[PDB]
Design a protein around this ligand. Structure first.
Ligand code: AAU
Lengths: 99, 99
């Protein structure tokens, strides 16, 4: 699909048997979601940007479905104000910027 | 052009007759650049990010070239981690997300 940028590029994602709305963010290196539970082991990580840093839990090899496109990758979980889909997963769904 | 996301989508922009490196960021509503000087009066603006908020200076009708594409719009200046080209200008240069 082709998504314009007149409005925030929000899409529904399916992760851990849960449905959530997330922002397709080309400026984000990693995918970070609001507090939720995920399987497997995790590593603490600190991610920052505008406003400073937040502490998150890093889970690797996590399955996620974005706009029907399945992908696997690292998901950070923490106090983010919005669910973000970063480049680490945008690449897997073949997402590109065009102009 | 078509830009893949295996790496940060950093491009060259020109503003105030100077070249700067910036991030094409679909997750950003606005364009925010690191401290610099711009003409005219400015208005107050707060941008909410991953770690909280920051105060910035808002300048309107500013000429800016993005990857060779000329644009004229609102440019915010403040303590941002990197120069960010947000949706307000991505829409002006006809940029979209595709997959
Ligand atoms: C609302 O308009 C703007 C918001 C931002 C702040 N911002 C953010 O807070 N970040 C932080 C961030 C989040 C996730 C990541 O995986 C990530 O990895 C780099 C960074 N970004 C950025 O700041 C990009 C800059 C950057 C580059 C390298 C680095 O080491 C740290 C930061 C990405 C932006 O898209 C964006 C994502 C976002 C949106 C709403 C609420 C919270 C965050 C900004 C402008 C708006 O108009």
């Amino acid at each position: 699909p082709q998504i314009t940028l007149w409005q925030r590029p929000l899409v529904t994602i399916k992760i851990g048997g849960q449905l959530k709305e997330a922002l397709l963010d080309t400026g984000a290196d990693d995918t970070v979601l609001e507090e939720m539970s995920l399987p497997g082991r995790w590593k603490p990580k600190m991610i920052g940007g505008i406003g400073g840093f937040i502490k998150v839990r890093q889970y690797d090899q996590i399955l996620i479905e974005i706009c029907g496109h399945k992908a696997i990758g690292t998901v950070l979980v923490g106090p983010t104000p919005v669910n973000i889909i970063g480049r680490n997963l945008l690449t897997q769904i073949g997402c590109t910027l065009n102009f």
